[model samples]
Target: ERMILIRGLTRVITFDDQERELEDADILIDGPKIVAVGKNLSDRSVSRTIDGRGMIALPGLINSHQHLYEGAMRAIPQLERVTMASWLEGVLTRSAGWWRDGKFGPDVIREVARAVLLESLLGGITTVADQHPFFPGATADSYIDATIEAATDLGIRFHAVRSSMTLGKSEGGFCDDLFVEPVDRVVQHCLGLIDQYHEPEPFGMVRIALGPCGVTHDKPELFEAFAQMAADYDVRLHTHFYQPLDAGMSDHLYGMTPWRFLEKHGWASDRVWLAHAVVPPREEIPEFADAGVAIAHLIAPDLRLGWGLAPIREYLDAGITVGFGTTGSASNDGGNLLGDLRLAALAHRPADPNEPEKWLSARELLRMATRGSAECLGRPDLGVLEEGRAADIACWRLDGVDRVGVHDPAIGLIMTGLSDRASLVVVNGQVLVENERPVLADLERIVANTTALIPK
Candidate 1:
């Protein structure tokens, strides 16, 4: 372990309790924790120094929701701009075919996961909650281990959402029967994952969470089993929730609204976080907030697939935690989390001229991307640059053409440069990206490996 010093940073956006931003400051990192963040930290003994002369440093961006295995399918001609049902069928069919044919094994998944995680690192995201619903083979443990190994090799923080699909078209669900497993088997698999990979220690790189695909793709008993498992194991829960189709399917199958069914199954609680809550009832916002439920808002897929934006302002006003996510590569077409910030901030206009709070500011959005997202993942140790916090930090250069005349660098961080490359990215005190490129492995080699595996 080495003491690294980041000196002369133009701005340090420390989303601490007071939301402090220090100018002309330095950050001192001792191994995996931040020792100090302030002026004159240059005096500390160090193994290396990053000259952050014109760079703005913030806590490494946390992507609350992602599907890493789809990294190779970005912008597939057949899937782009399609409706949710059509897109899911196309994506799931390919994935299920690969698994059934034994074309997708642990090695294949590792390459795809590496491709996506490396892209995320280069774009300033250091942590991801990857929801892996489609297993590569019958027993899913090896595929899960493959992804954990990928994240570890790249030095990225990984929260593996061991997602399951237990209801198929045979049972009136979206997934095929071949991809669906029995409820008991799914629970047993989740228990195995939790036992093997769920690290409860602070500053650990990997963790595990339970995520059944959704109400439409899983049975009610599966959801209840996951809830009970989460309660017993003390791990968090995740799921796709509240899309229009989700509501329709829930009504047809369970004779209730989606949220009502979730509540009935004991899923609408603090332990759970829902993804793409696009169409939750306005009346239930406060109840969701009261239950401490968090929302992982996927901005890219919403507009790309014609799914309208979630009621983010309403959710924030109601005290529900809302965080940013770039859905699967097929829908989002990319994994640059920082690149999505401008759209995330500008997409919401004031519903009423009198209610200026309807629009989110850059500072607010950045905070949401960091602190709000960490809260969604139930990770208190991440998302802040304070003493005793994990040393996951990102520095973005402000001298680029996109930043011309950007008087406010902090706001410029969110407003300028789509896919802006980070000058430096440190995950767990390890520098994985330097000078806008990944250092652990060749990015092109990863891409080519993924390209070789895609269905022709």
Candidate 2:
């Protein structure tokens, strides 16, 4: 790798310890780490220079929680009015058909994963915690490998979780049996994936996580065992919790709320991060905070899905790390993580009731999208533009239509800006997106392929 120097009228927003913003800054990258970030850095042997004039550079946005495979299932009409339980049922039904139709098999999955990953990068997100559930006869290795290939091809960091569903309606679970794989097989594949891809090092680009599908779909024993596997491998854990309003689920099975059950089973820990924590009780918030467990709040997607608002105030007051996520296009109907950030910030206003003083500030929301997300994924080196940190950065045109007359570019970025088309994107000291387009991915090809595959 050669040294690269980025210089122009830059506005670098460092979501560091103090959330500093630097104007007319220059960033130098050496290999996969940021060598320096300041004005007029010494570049004795610069190899490549990227002009960042008229741009706002920030840490590459991180999607702390998402379902990549659901990209193929985008625009299902029924999803509009679907509740969480109904959505799971519909997915179980439709996924079987998708598998039988042979259109959404491993090949299409790989393609979609590539498309979604590239789309995310184009929208300034350089890393994602993708929770993809494995169905019957689906090779777990292939599923994870496809994600790795997509992330690698697009030069994005990937945290692929081995999400599994073992309980079916037949077994008093939420999903159908056809979509459920045997528990033993699921465990075997999960451990194998951990061995193959789980990288615990701070700067490692690829990592694997243990992910049980959700509280209602996974067996209690399997959930505990999965946590132990993650512990043994020294990898993070992920799962869905407290999202769907399935009060009867506990009474029908475990006789406790999803949160308490997981806590009892030793699944709630700092190493574990839960998605869509919309319904966790106020008391449980502090418990999770005390345990140092992070939460990814998919605020927009939850609202879109008719899940009530999460206790955002409770979580924030407890000093728990929370990040914004788009969930997926099928649910969010949009792939813009920046929009997710803005919406998440605005969503907290009602809880505060004091307007600007009570609302999440532009800086606060940006931190959630970057540093808070990195912490959720157990990655401290990412989501910051300091020395020795991963060179994951995004640049937006400050003069773009979204910030036309804004006095403060950083404030305009979060307050008025509405999309993810970064003027420049750098991941691991590599330029992945320049001039609002991906350097390696074929956007036209992905759109055409996706359009061709959508059901009539």
Candidate 3:
């Protein structure tokens, strides 16, 4: 922990009850937590201060859902112009094969995870919920260790959501080779991971969660057992539900819709978050908020691939916890969450002339990216720069020519501001990025090794 003070900012965005968006605020950091945030905060002389003029200081972006080791395989030529099931088949199933066959070895996993984490940090995403699957060759312990190691090295808050699948295409799901462990072993694996890695500290840099893949690819009993396991461990549950283009496969296989399938087992409670809940009927949207189950909105990522957009407007109206998630490199194609933020704000526009602002505003988008994600992760201490909260923050450069004479900094940032690079990013009160470059990571080595590991 280091003593750093961010002094004299253009603006600071906060969702706390006290104030929202302070002007020229001074944030004082004492260690892993914020000690003060206000105008002209008095600080001890021993702390180092950073000039925050002509910049916007905000809580670090949170990616509610995403994948690791997939950033290196962005824009695979064979995957051109695919969507939904075909897209999953082309990118996901095949990629799991690469992982199972040892193409994504320990070295490969380390480098890929490092590169993606660095990319995410540079984009001002300090915390990421990586719901990833491990292959046969890569043990769960190995996968968790690799991700935790990369995150620790890069100074980012990481929640490694270790996910897996059991059912195969022959059994009415994708990824036949993905799950080799029996149901009991899989449950034990998750239990072991939670016991070994899931930290209960508020400001801890690393933690663990459970994501047993989508409901379609697992036995109903498997999800039930793991749901109980997650409850016993007090960790959140995640899975791919309400995916687009399932093509009635859920009804045919599970004898119900995916959402119904989970609800049938009493697993749709507050402790669960469902990704890509894009196509639930308009009336059923409230059930999520009523159940206190958060939704990870893939607005831009889904729009980028034309897999139908999430009804975020409805979710918001019901006071649901909704956050942005860039699913994978093949889907979002960029590791930049700030860009994802911008794209998500604009992707929800209604085609009709009289929809009356159903789309999210710039500030709303920022809230979804920060507070919404924090709600999903069950971390109230994060995504806010209040006293006693985690000191995870990012400062965007506002002096760029493109941003000159910007009337509204926050609006400009989301509307058309192209300056995505952060001049300063501090996670856990540790300065990890300064001068638009990573302070600790060797970008050159990581990129070179990542490029060398390309499967295509």
Candidate 4:
């Protein structure tokens, strides 16, 4: 049992409704929740004390969409210039070869999952919605267990979406039939995982979400069945939509746009969030807003993969909550959420051009990475710095070279290309990262495990 006191913070950027910025503040944490946050609290006694002078403390970032296992396939030069569809095609080919040899096992996934989770914690992300795909020769239990182990070791909030594909490439989907499990097996595993781990209580660290693969990956009946299951379990839903040429096999098979197809199948609901919503037109934005369906724009990965810009202006105008996501290391190459934020801001408002105010503000972009993402995940308690909230916090030292010569520290910390690591990170009241390093796991062990598992 320990009581930690963090004092002498230069500033605290609170993404609360008021968006308050407190200077020279102090925070107290007992066990796993924030006890107090104010000024001059150092006089109190505690087992440990962290000096936060000349630092900026804020809520730990939330990543609404991510794929941890994809870290192994990152930086593959052969996949460059390949769109999302083509990338899927290429990866699936290699996956088949490994599966045929019975060598495409869960070892690499386990190692990469652990390494990616630790890497995310290093960058100050306390919460993530992980989309783990069980390729051929993979079992759902093994995948889920690996994710749970990684997340538990890292001490971050994890939401695992049981994503599955039932249609194969021959059936107009991206994955092979070998990767597609029977609907009964998928439902059984999904429900079992939910019963085993889905915590509905506020601020709980682990939860399960129901994902129906994607627009063209499963039958329309599967979508409705999954929705009913999610409602019965009272968990959230996640799926991918609107990417890889809107008029490809999806249009050919479903006879409608991706968004419309999802809506027609009763998949568009307030409880659902669509990842990489990169092609919703100006007119259809309001429909999503009216349905209260959230969209997580993976701007950097989308652009890097040759997907065009999402309709940011329309989405915002329609009163929809737009969150930011880093997608995956395979797509974005760099797993840095702050860099993703900067890329999103720049891509939306390029210097070359017509609309000046088209770019997102530093504060708004930060909010998207934090509170907006929380809303997208349907977890309000994970992204705010206030009393009674989960103790997920990040602090960046302002005296470092990355933050020098900044008139406004917040803008410079967010807008500029500063590699500001989390000096202090507390997730669910656990001091995971202190002084820009993890306290629980060894980084070298994770590296060695991942390196040894990579395919030759």
Candidate 5:
């Protein structure tokens, strides 16, 4: 724990209340906390200093939702006609047997998870809400511990959601019977994991949540069970819901729209956040806002999987919080959360028609990537570079050819996608990435371990 000074930044983008940007600023850090954030944080007592010249220092980006396990299959073919159930099942089949194939061990799962997280840091995302289902025969703690090991080694802020499945397709669930387990067993393991790994302290590098898959896989009883479990443990709730022309998860399953079904089941509250949400009705958008439910908008996955665009603007304008996510790399070829911010900002222009009077500016998009996402993870101490906050910050060099002739560095930075490298990524005031590379471990070794898992 050493004091460090970040000197000579082009500017600091604070996604704080009022969303202001500081010009030619310097930040002061002591141990795991930001002692102060402003100009001329004198370097006398600092043990190390990062010359932030030619860079835009900002809070680390938070990826509200994604599946690190799905990173195992980096390329999924886009079918001409895709249904949510079929596509998800197809992807799950490919990875579920990686353990059964006998060619590799669960160690293979760790490497694949590592590969995705490494790509995440390069994309300037320091925090992720990583949700994945449990595999057969493995203890509930198995893959969860594996990913925790990966994230700890990588020095990223990780919120791990131990998602479960306990019903099969014949039972009107989403996937095969091989995927489901006893509902009681699933809940017990989830509770056990909460006691073992969940850190309730602010600025903790790792936290935990519980998800019983989605409406299609989880039994109706398990929904309230999970909501109660989340409340008892004081953790956030996560699940997948509605996608690709479905009349709402309700009508598709219980004969009602998705939002109405969620409301009836007591799952549409503020602590709950969902992935995809690709097909929720426009008329019901305000209800979600009023209820304080947040959305982890997985736009890249929707477009890549042909799931159709979500009414993202509808959610944002309705005052419902929304954040950007890369989803799983299985659908999109890579994890570029930064570039996806540009995509999120511009994606609505064609059908929604950009409002010349009120554009989705770089300011707003970056806010979603940071603060909006922080709200989703239930971590108020993160997503903003301010005094007494966790020193989870990122610096992007502005010297790249992509950044030439910039009138406004903050807007220009976003307009040009993100920086070529994170340059510096600090989580808990400890530098995890320096000189455009990770300080914790070798990035290439992690990649090679993952590449070795290729089907041979």
Candidate 6:
């Protein structure tokens, strides 16, 4: 482990107990933990000193949900105007044929995963919860290992959520049968992954979670077993819940709403954080809060798929933890979390045009992208830049042309583009991105390989 000192930052947004922003501060990082975060933090033995002048520092952004496997298929013309069902049919089922036919090998998976994670890191996202599910021709371990290798090589913190689907369209789900695995097989695979990769130590770079795409994608028994495994292994749970088709399908398949289906299957507990919860009723808000269920508000897909805006204001008002996610690259088309932060700040106003007071502020959205996302992923050590916290931080250049007239630097982080790239991003005490480019990755090679791997 080496030491690095970033001195003279124009501003430092520390999402600590005080939620304070310091000016002209210095951050001292030793190994994976922050040793000091205040003005004039001196260390003569530091191996590197970054001049942070004219840069605003914040705890690195976290993407609570992502699908890195879809990186190579971004901006598919056929998928541009499709509905969610068509998207699943085209992207997950038809596109998964590439994997089913032994085309998407481990090397291809590694390149695609690297491309997406590198994109995330450049956008100031230091930690990403990747919900990877598709595995057909090879062992799930091979695909997972390849993806994890990419994350390890890039030095970004990762939550490899072992997502699965046992019920396909023939069994009343959206995935094709060839891509679906047996229930016990999926559970056993998750257990193996947790044993092999889940890191429980504070500031550990990787963790494993379970996510069986639910109601419309997996059986009720799958949810029970995964939830039990999560409890037994002390890992978290995730699933697609309350999306556009969720309520209708859950009611038809399980004779109850999506929330009730989860409630019946032991998935409504605090261990679970859901994706695309855009249609939950207001009456269930209290129960969700009481049960400590969190939601990943996927702003990009909601807009791209026309899935409508989530009632995030109500979720926050009811004490439910809400985080931000860009969702799949095939859907969101990009892995830019900072861009989603700006969209979140602007997406809520139309719902209640008369209530300017209820709109989410830029600062609140920033906290959601960092601290709230950390809460969803069960990583308190990340998403904060105080002493003893993990050294996952982003340095945004404040001198960008887009930020010229911005008054508040902290608020401008969400409001302005800030060039849509982090000037420097440090993850796990390692500088992975410097000067708006990746330090450890060959972007040109990864991009070329990933593009070549995309099915014609």
**Model number with the top lDDT:** 6
Each candidate: RMSD: 1.7, 1.9, 2.0, 2.0, 2.2, 1.6
- Look at candidate 5 and tell me the lDDT of residue 367: 82
- In candidate 4, position 184 carries an lDDT of 74
| Shift of residue 63 alpha carbon in model 6, Å | 0.9
Structural similarity to truth (TM-score) of each candidate: 0.96, 0.95, 0.95, 0.94, 0.94, 0.96
lDDT of 3 by residue, 9-54 (tens): 9888887766478888899998888988899877665358898988
The superposed Cα distance between candidate 1 and the true structure at residue 125, in angstroms, equals 0.7
Q: Candidate 1 has which clashing residue pairs, if any? A: none
- Model 5 TM-score (2 dp): 0.94
Q: Tell me the TM-score of model 4.
A: 0.94
Predicted candidate 3, C-alpha RMSD? 2.0
- Answer with 1 or 2, whichever has the higher TM-score: 1
lDDT score for residue 280 of model 2? 74
Alpha-carbon runs more than 4 Å astray in model 1: 350-355
Worst 10-residue lDDT window, candidate 2: 134-143
Task: Please provide, for model 4 over 194-243, each residue's C-alpha lDDT reduced to its tens digit, 9 standing for 90 to 100.
Answer: 88888889878899988876877877777877888878878888898777
Query: For model 5, what is the alpha-carbon lDDT of residue 344?
Result: 63
Cα displacement (angstroms), candidate 2, residue 390, comes to 0.3
- Backbone clash count for every predicted candidate, in the order shown: 0, 0, 0, 0, 2, 0
In candidate 5, position 168 carries an lDDT of: 72
Name the regions of candidate 4 deviating beyond 4 angstroms: 42-45, 99-103, 137-141, 351-354
